[PDB]
C-alpha cells in the first residue's frame, strides 16, 4: 500500500530537454549524442523541444548546465562527455571537476542534470560504452533525463 | 548528569518518510528496499506515511532528495542504491557524486537524508550487505531514518 | 531518402504478449520475469494483454512458444530462461536446444519470439545480467518484444 | 493482475504418457526409467496410461518420439537416455543428434517431448544424476512431462 | 532539426577576457600565457580587452577569478597554472584546490572560468603540453575561453 | 600592450594580515610562523598590523579564517599548518579538510586566504620545507599574502 | 493469503527478561551486556522487568537459564558470553557445552533462551562483534529476545 512514485517514459508531452556535449573525445561523444537523440526521437520528443549545446571540454559542462538549468526553458539537462584517463593523472582533475559541476548544476538549479559523461581508463572501454557490448551511454542518459523530467513535473510538484 | 539526547525508534507516530531507491543494480537495491519497508512496518510506520521514489541511478538520488527534503512533507529521507566498483574506476565518480549529493541534501534542506547506498567492490559483498551475513543495509537505513526523524522532531527543535 | 522502418515502443495499444519463463534457475529467471513485467508496465502494456507461462526447463520453452505463436492470441513471445554452464558440458545441449527451439518458434509461426534466455558460465555473471551491472536481460527482452510486435503489426504488414 | 498459466501436477486424470528409453548405458537408463515410473505412480498416473518403448540407442529416440507424438495416443513423450562422453568425441555426434531429434519431435508433432537424456562426461556424474546427490533425472523428466501435458491439455488449448 | 547552439571563435567583437596565471612553475606557465595571448591576437582580440593577472600560486587562482568574475568587466576568465606532482603528494592538495576553486569561480559568478592549469606528473609532460608534441595548453584554453564567451553572450542569454 | 596586473611586495602601507597557525606539529609550524613573521618584518609590515591566531589543529583553521575574513579587519589571511601523513591514512582526512576549509575561507569571504599548510609524507621533508633546502614555506606564504593583499586592494577594486 | 506470524519489537508491555552473562572474558561480555541493556531501554523495557544474573563462566549458563526458565518469572532468557578459542582446543568443549545448555534451556522450559554467546577464534573478532564493525551481539540478542517473547506471548499461545 506504499505509494511508489516513478517517472514515465511515455508521457513526454510538454517536456523540453537541453543536451550539453563536449567536443573533446568527439569520437566518443558524437555516438553518445546520436544515441541520445535517437532515444529522444523514439519516445516522441520533438526536435524543437531539444537543444544541443557544444562545449570545448567537460570542465565547461558544469557552468553551462547551471546556466541552462536556471533559465527555466528546460525540464532536464543532459551532460554528455568522455574522459579517457590512460596511464597518467592528467585527466583525473577534469573528470572530478566535471562530475562536481554536473552535481552542482543538478542541485543548485532544481532542474535534474543527467551525468552522461564517460570516465573510462582505455578507449576500447569508451567505445564499448558508446554503442558497443555495454550499450550506448547517451541512450541511457536520454532515458534517464526523460524519466527524471516526468518525475519532477508530474510527481514531485 | 549530562543530558544524553537520543532519537526514539518507538515514537513513530506522525513521522513521514520518503525512500529514494535507484533502479540500477536492482538485484541489490530491491532487497534493500524490501528490508527498509519491512523495518518501517515492524516499527508501526503506516503505509500512507511512506513514499517510494524510483530513480534511474544513484547520481540522480541527490537531486531528488533535495527536492523531497525542501517540500516539508517528510521528516526523513532514505537514499537506497548500490554501486559495485569492480576492477575499474568507471563507477567511482558515480559513488562519490551520490555520497556528495546525499550529504548536500541532508545539509541544505534540514531534513535528515540517510545514506543507504552500498559501495562495495564485488557483488558478493553487496549481496552479503543486502540481507546476507552482514545484515540488510536497507533495514539499518530505515532504523537510522526513524531515529533521526525522532531526534529532529522531538529533541532538536 | 532511404525508408528506415523501425518498431515503436510507445504505440503499445492493442498488442498482447506471452512470456514463457522456465522454473529452472528460478533465482535468475524470477528477477528476469519481474524486470520484463516492469518494462511492460512502464510502457502502458495492460495486465490482461500479458500472459505468463511457466515451464519446468528451457528445453520445453521452444515447444510452448510454437504452441503460443500458432494460436494468434499474441503479437510477440518472450522466452525467459537461465542456463548456467559451469565446468561441465551437461547444460550445453540444453542451451543449444533452447536457442534452436526459440529460433524455430520465431520462424515457423510468424510471431516474433524473443530470446531472453541467459547462457552464462558462472552464476555471478547471470546475477549481473539479471539486474546487476549489465542491466536486466528480462527488461531488454520485453523492450525487444514491444519493438518487434510494433514492427510486425505496423510496418511489416 | 497478469495471468500466470502453469501446468498442474495433481490433475493427472485422462493423461497418457509414452516413455522412450534407450538400452545403451542401461546401467544409467534403467534407474532413470524406474525413477520416472515411480514419479508417475506417486502422482496417480495409471499403468495402462503409460507405455514404455525400448530403443537400442539415443539416436533412434527422435524417430520413435516423432512416431509416438504423431499418433495422438499420448499427451507427453519422455525421452530417457544416457550419453557418457569420456575423453573422445565419438559420442558427441550421438548426443547432439539425440537432442536435435527430441527437439524436432517436440516441435513437429505438437506433443511435448521431454529431454531426459543424460549427457555427462564421466560415469560417476551420470550415477549421481540417476539417483545420486543430484537426484534422479528420470523423476524430474516424469514431473516435467506431467506438468507439460497438463499445460497443453488444460491451459494452452 | 534539433537546434545545435555552439560558440563562435570569429565573433570576438566586444568580448573582454581576464587571464589569471600563476608565477609558480613559470618555466611552464609563461609559454602557456604566451600561447594564450598569441591565440587571442590571432582571433582579433584587442590588447585593451585582455587583462593578465599574476598570482604567486595556483591555490590563489580560484580566489582571484571569483573576484574577477563578479566584477562584470570580463566575459570569460582564463586560469593558467602548472602543478607538477612528482613522486610525492605535496602538490596533490594544491592541484585539487586549484581545480575546485576554478570550478567554483565558474559556477558562483556566471562568467565561464577556463581551467588551463596543467596537472602533470613529470616536467617533460608539462613541457610537451606547453608547446610540445601535445600542443599548447594555453592556446587551447584561450580558444575555449573565446568559444565559451561567445556562447554565453550570443546563445545562452 | 596587454595590461599585466600584479601585486606589489613594496606597497605594504595600510595592509593588515592575520596568521592562523595550528599548534599540532609545532616543531614544524613554529619555524614556519617565525619565517612568516620575519618576511613581514623585512617588508615593512608593522607589528600592530599582524595578528597571530593559534588553533589546536589544521581542521580548525578553516573555521577561524572564515571568521577572520568576514570581519573586515584584515586584507589577507595566512593559514600555517603541518600535516605529516606517514604510512597510514589517519591524517589524509585532516589535510583534505584543511585545504577545503582554506579554499572556502578564501572564496566565501573575499579576503585572500593563503594556504601555507605543509602536507608532506615524512618529517624530514617537512623540516626541509620549513627552513631547509626547499626554503621556508612560511616565508613564501607571507610573501604570497602580501602580494595578494596588494593585488586585491590596489588592482582588483 | 498465508498467515505470517512474527514477533513485535514495539509491544514490550508486560514482558520480563532475564540476562545471564558470564564473567569470563569480561572485556567482551560487559560491552555485550551494555548493548543488550541499551537495546532494552530503547524499546521501552523497564528496569524492574530486567534481571541480570552473573555466572563465573559459560558452562554454568545453561544450568542457570534452565533454573530461570522454569520459574515462570521471565518471558525470555538472554545468554551472554564470550568463548575465544585461539590456537588450541581447550575452549572447544566449553563452547559446545554452552551451546548445548542454552539449547536445552530453551527446549526443556518453554521460555525462549537466546544464544548471545560469542564463539570467535581471535579477540579482535570478538571486539568487532561486541560493538565494532560487525555490530553489538548483545544488542542483537536483546532484540531477538524481545521478538521471541512477543511471538510466544501474543502469537504462539
mmCIF file of N, CA, C and O in Angstrom, chain F residues 13-68:
data_model
loop_
_atom_site.group_PDB
_atom_site.id
_atom_site.type_symbol
_atom_site.label_atom_id
_atom_site.label_comp_id
_atom_site.label_asym_id
_atom_site.label_seq_id
_atom_site.Cartn_x
_atom_site.Cartn_y
_atom_site.Cartn_z
ATOM 1 N N UNK F 13 51.987 49.543 2.923
ATOM 2 C CA UNK F 13 51.381 50.510 3.828
ATOM 3 C C UNK F 13 49.873 50.305 3.890
ATOM 4 O O UNK F 13 49.212 50.152 2.857
ATOM 5 N N UNK F 14 49.330 50.298 5.104
ATOM 6 C CA UNK F 14 47.901 50.169 5.295
ATOM 7 C C UNK F 14 47.352 48.768 5.163
ATOM 8 O O UNK F 14 46.127 48.603 5.145
ATOM 9 N N UNK F 15 48.208 47.757 5.068
ATOM 10 C CA UNK F 15 47.777 46.373 4.926
ATOM 11 C C UNK F 15 47.916 45.650 6.258
ATOM 12 O O UNK F 15 48.989 45.667 6.871
ATOM 13 N N UNK F 16 46.833 45.019 6.701
ATOM 14 C CA UNK F 16 46.817 44.232 7.924
ATOM 15 C C UNK F 16 46.626 42.761 7.583
ATOM 16 O O UNK F 16 45.824 42.416 6.710
ATOM 17 N N UNK F 17 47.364 41.897 8.277
ATOM 18 C CA UNK F 17 47.363 40.470 7.996
ATOM 19 C C UNK F 17 47.062 39.688 9.265
ATOM 20 O O UNK F 17 47.495 40.066 10.357
ATOM 21 N N UNK F 18 46.320 38.596 9.110
ATOM 22 C CA UNK F 18 46.047 37.662 10.193
ATOM 23 C C UNK F 18 46.686 36.326 9.852
ATOM 24 O O UNK F 18 46.527 35.826 8.733
ATOM 25 N N UNK F 19 47.410 35.755 10.809
ATOM 26 C CA UNK F 19 48.119 34.497 10.621
ATOM 27 C C UNK F 19 47.470 33.458 11.523
ATOM 28 O O UNK F 19 47.505 33.585 12.754
ATOM 29 N N UNK F 20 46.877 32.435 10.919
ATOM 30 C CA UNK F 20 46.304 31.309 11.646
ATOM 31 C C UNK F 20 47.305 30.165 11.595
ATOM 32 O O UNK F 20 47.627 29.660 10.513
ATOM 33 N N UNK F 21 47.802 29.755 12.759
ATOM 34 C CA UNK F 21 48.822 28.718 12.858
ATOM 35 C C UNK F 21 48.318 27.629 13.794
ATOM 36 O O UNK F 21 47.832 27.922 14.893
ATOM 37 N N UNK F 22 48.420 26.377 13.354
ATOM 38 C CA UNK F 22 47.993 25.246 14.164
ATOM 39 C C UNK F 22 49.096 24.829 15.127
ATOM 40 O O UNK F 22 50.279 24.833 14.778
ATOM 41 N N UNK F 23 48.700 24.471 16.349
ATOM 42 C CA UNK F 23 49.662 24.035 17.352
ATOM 43 C C UNK F 23 50.119 22.597 17.155
ATOM 44 O O UNK F 23 51.145 22.210 17.724
ATOM 45 N N UNK F 24 49.393 21.800 16.375
ATOM 46 C CA UNK F 24 49.826 20.439 16.094
ATOM 47 C C UNK F 24 51.025 20.460 15.154
ATOM 48 O O UNK F 24 51.104 21.292 14.245
ATOM 49 N N UNK F 25 51.960 19.535 15.380
ATOM 50 C CA UNK F 25 53.252 19.536 14.695
ATOM 51 C C UNK F 25 53.950 20.881 14.870
ATOM 52 O O UNK F 25 54.432 21.493 13.915
ATOM 53 N N UNK F 26 53.993 21.347 16.122
ATOM 54 C CA UNK F 26 54.556 22.663 16.405
ATOM 55 C C UNK F 26 56.035 22.733 16.052
ATOM 56 O O UNK F 26 56.547 23.818 15.758
ATOM 57 N N UNK F 27 56.728 21.591 16.049
ATOM 58 C CA UNK F 27 58.127 21.559 15.644
ATOM 59 C C UNK F 27 58.294 22.005 14.198
ATOM 60 O O UNK F 27 59.390 22.410 13.795
ATOM 61 N N UNK F 28 57.228 21.951 13.405
ATOM 62 C CA UNK F 28 57.249 22.430 12.031
ATOM 63 C C UNK F 28 56.520 23.760 11.891
ATOM 64 O O UNK F 28 56.978 24.648 11.172
ATOM 65 N N UNK F 29 55.386 23.920 12.575
ATOM 66 C CA UNK F 29 54.583 25.126 12.404
ATOM 67 C C UNK F 29 55.204 26.341 13.080
ATOM 68 O O UNK F 29 54.896 27.475 12.697
ATOM 69 N N UNK F 30 56.073 26.141 14.079
ATOM 70 C CA UNK F 30 56.703 27.295 14.719
ATOM 71 C C UNK F 30 57.803 27.899 13.855
ATOM 72 O O UNK F 30 57.843 29.135 13.727
ATOM 73 N N UNK F 31 58.719 27.128 13.255
ATOM 74 C CA UNK F 31 59.637 27.746 12.283
ATOM 75 C C UNK F 31 58.924 28.372 11.099
ATOM 76 O O UNK F 31 59.384 29.400 10.590
ATOM 77 N N UNK F 32 57.806 27.793 10.651
ATOM 78 C CA UNK F 32 57.032 28.416 9.580
ATOM 79 C C UNK F 32 56.492 29.774 10.010
ATOM 80 O O UNK F 32 56.559 30.750 9.251
ATOM 81 N N UNK F 33 55.950 29.855 11.228
ATOM 82 C CA UNK F 33 55.444 31.127 11.730
ATOM 83 C C UNK F 33 56.568 32.142 11.892
ATOM 84 O O UNK F 33 56.393 33.328 11.588
ATOM 85 N N UNK F 34 57.729 31.696 12.374
ATOM 86 C CA UNK F 34 58.860 32.607 12.520
ATOM 87 C C UNK F 34 59.328 33.122 11.166
ATOM 88 O O UNK F 34 59.659 34.304 11.025
ATOM 89 N N UNK F 35 59.358 32.251 10.155
ATOM 90 C CA UNK F 35 59.708 32.697 8.817
ATOM 91 C C UNK F 35 58.707 33.687 8.252
ATOM 92 O O UNK F 35 59.085 34.679 7.624
ATOM 93 N N UNK F 36 57.415 33.431 8.468
ATOM 94 C CA UNK F 36 56.389 34.360 8.003
ATOM 95 C C UNK F 36 56.519 35.716 8.686
ATOM 96 O O UNK F 36 56.411 36.763 8.034
ATOM 97 N N UNK F 37 56.759 35.719 9.999
ATOM 98 C CA UNK F 37 56.916 36.979 10.721
ATOM 99 C C UNK F 37 58.181 37.710 10.287
ATOM 100 O O UNK F 37 58.187 38.942 10.185
ATOM 101 N N UNK F 38 59.261 36.972 10.025
ATOM 102 C CA UNK F 38 60.469 37.601 9.520
ATOM 103 C C UNK F 38 60.270 38.218 8.149
ATOM 104 O O UNK F 38 60.773 39.309 7.870
ATOM 105 N N UNK F 39 59.536 37.527 7.274
ATOM 106 C CA UNK F 39 59.217 38.098 5.969
ATOM 107 C C UNK F 39 58.363 39.351 6.112
ATOM 108 O O UNK F 39 58.596 40.352 5.424
ATOM 109 N N UNK F 40 57.377 39.321 7.011
ATOM 110 C CA UNK F 40 56.561 40.508 7.246
ATOM 111 C C UNK F 40 57.411 41.670 7.744
ATOM 112 O O UNK F 40 57.235 42.813 7.304
ATOM 113 N N UNK F 41 58.343 41.397 8.659
ATOM 114 C CA UNK F 41 59.202 42.458 9.176
ATOM 115 C C UNK F 41 60.131 43.002 8.096
ATOM 116 O O UNK F 41 60.372 44.213 8.029
ATOM 117 N N UNK F 42 60.664 42.124 7.242
ATOM 118 C CA UNK F 42 61.584 42.557 6.195
ATOM 119 C C UNK F 42 60.908 43.415 5.135
ATOM 120 O O UNK F 42 61.601 44.121 4.396
ATOM 121 N N UNK F 43 59.580 43.370 5.038
ATOM 122 C CA UNK F 43 58.841 44.124 4.034
ATOM 123 C C UNK F 43 58.042 45.269 4.651
ATOM 124 O O UNK F 43 57.002 45.666 4.118
ATOM 125 N N UNK F 44 58.521 45.797 5.779
ATOM 126 C CA UNK F 44 57.969 46.999 6.408
ATOM 127 C C UNK F 44 56.514 46.821 6.833
ATOM 128 O O UNK F 44 55.722 47.764 6.777
ATOM 129 N N UNK F 45 56.147 45.620 7.267
ATOM 130 C CA UNK F 45 54.827 45.375 7.837
ATOM 131 C C UNK F 45 54.931 45.525 9.349
ATOM 132 O O UNK F 45 55.728 44.837 9.997
ATOM 133 N N UNK F 46 54.132 46.429 9.910
ATOM 134 C CA UNK F 46 54.230 46.745 11.325
ATOM 135 C C UNK F 46 53.626 45.633 12.179
ATOM 136 O O UNK F 46 52.775 44.859 11.735
ATOM 137 N N UNK F 47 54.090 45.563 13.430
ATOM 138 C CA UNK F 47 53.623 44.522 14.343
ATOM 139 C C UNK F 47 52.141 44.679 14.663
ATOM 140 O O UNK F 47 51.419 43.682 14.779
ATOM 141 N N UNK F 48 51.668 45.918 14.814
ATOM 142 C CA UNK F 48 50.261 46.138 15.131
ATOM 143 C C UNK F 48 49.336 45.805 13.970
ATOM 144 O O UNK F 48 48.117 45.754 14.169
ATOM 145 N N UNK F 49 49.874 45.581 12.774
ATOM 146 C CA UNK F 49 49.088 45.157 11.626
ATOM 147 C C UNK F 49 49.092 43.647 11.437
ATOM 148 O O UNK F 49 48.531 43.156 10.454
ATOM 149 N N UNK F 50 49.709 42.900 12.350
ATOM 150 C CA UNK F 50 49.805 41.449 12.261
ATOM 151 C C UNK F 50 49.166 40.849 13.503
ATOM 152 O O UNK F 50 49.530 41.207 14.629
ATOM 153 N N UNK F 51 48.213 39.945 13.297
ATOM 154 C CA UNK F 51 47.588 39.195 14.377
ATOM 155 C C UNK F 51 47.832 37.711 14.154
ATOM 156 O O UNK F 51 47.546 37.187 13.072
ATOM 157 N N UNK F 52 48.360 37.039 15.172
ATOM 158 C CA UNK F 52 48.635 35.609 15.120
ATOM 159 C C UNK F 52 47.580 34.899 15.954
ATOM 160 O O UNK F 52 47.446 35.163 17.156
ATOM 161 N N UNK F 53 46.829 34.005 15.319
ATOM 162 C CA UNK F 53 45.779 33.239 15.974
ATOM 163 C C UNK F 53 46.219 31.785 16.034
ATOM 164 O O UNK F 53 46.581 31.197 15.008
ATOM 165 N N UNK F 54 46.194 31.210 17.232
ATOM 166 C CA UNK F 54 46.607 29.831 17.450
ATOM 167 C C UNK F 54 45.382 28.930 17.502
ATOM 168 O O UNK F 54 44.394 29.255 18.169
ATOM 169 N N UNK F 55 45.451 27.806 16.797
ATOM 170 C CA UNK F 55 44.371 26.824 16.800
ATOM 171 C C UNK F 55 44.958 25.462 17.150
ATOM 172 O O UNK F 55 46.132 25.199 16.850
ATOM 173 N N UNK F 56 44.198 24.580 17.805
ATOM 174 C CA UNK F 56 44.753 23.267 18.171
ATOM 175 C C UNK F 56 45.187 22.427 16.983
ATOM 176 O O UNK F 56 46.164 21.677 17.097
ATOM 177 N N UNK F 57 44.497 22.524 15.846
ATOM 178 C CA UNK F 57 44.827 21.696 14.705
ATOM 179 C C UNK F 57 44.443 22.357 13.400
ATOM 180 O O UNK F 57 43.825 23.423 13.371
ATOM 181 N N UNK F 58 44.823 21.694 12.304
ATOM 182 C CA UNK F 58 44.556 22.234 10.976
ATOM 183 C C UNK F 58 43.069 22.235 10.649
ATOM 184 O O UNK F 58 42.595 23.126 9.933
ATOM 185 N N UNK F 59 42.321 21.251 11.159
ATOM 186 C CA UNK F 59 40.892 21.176 10.874
ATOM 187 C C UNK F 59 40.162 22.429 11.339
ATOM 188 O O UNK F 59 39.182 22.847 10.711
ATOM 189 N N UNK F 60 40.626 23.045 12.424
ATOM 190 C CA UNK F 60 40.005 24.252 12.950
ATOM 191 C C UNK F 60 40.477 25.518 12.247
ATOM 192 O O UNK F 60 39.983 26.602 12.571
ATOM 193 N N UNK F 61 41.419 25.410 11.308
ATOM 194 C CA UNK F 61 41.918 26.597 10.619
ATOM 195 C C UNK F 61 40.825 27.214 9.754
ATOM 196 O O UNK F 61 40.572 28.424 9.816
ATOM 197 N N UNK F 62 40.147 26.388 8.954
ATOM 198 C CA UNK F 62 39.177 26.910 8.006
ATOM 199 C C UNK F 62 38.037 27.663 8.661
ATOM 200 O O UNK F 62 37.525 28.635 8.099
ATOM 201 N N UNK F 63 37.620 27.228 9.851
ATOM 202 C CA UNK F 63 36.577 27.950 10.570
ATOM 203 C C UNK F 63 37.078 29.286 11.100
ATOM 204 O O UNK F 63 36.306 30.249 11.173
ATOM 205 N N UNK F 64 38.355 29.368 11.476
ATOM 206 C CA UNK F 64 38.884 30.610 12.031
ATOM 207 C C UNK F 64 39.102 31.643 10.935
ATOM 208 O O UNK F 64 38.725 32.812 11.081
ATOM 209 N N UNK F 65 39.705 31.226 9.818
ATOM 210 C CA UNK F 65 39.955 32.160 8.725
ATOM 211 C C UNK F 65 38.653 32.754 8.205
ATOM 212 O O UNK F 65 38.555 33.969 7.999
ATOM 213 N N UNK F 66 37.634 31.912 8.013
ATOM 214 C CA UNK F 66 36.317 32.415 7.637
ATOM 215 C C UNK F 66 35.803 33.409 8.670
ATOM 216 O O UNK F 66 35.180 34.418 8.319
ATOM 217 N N UNK F 67 36.056 33.138 9.952
ATOM 218 C CA UNK F 67 35.712 34.101 10.990
ATOM 219 C C UNK F 67 36.536 35.376 10.852
ATOM 220 O O UNK F 67 36.013 36.482 11.028
ATOM 221 N N UNK F 68 37.827 35.242 10.537
ATOM 222 C CA UNK F 68 38.683 36.417 10.411
ATOM 223 C C UNK F 68 38.449 37.147 9.096
ATOM 224 O O UNK F 68 38.537 38.378 9.044
#
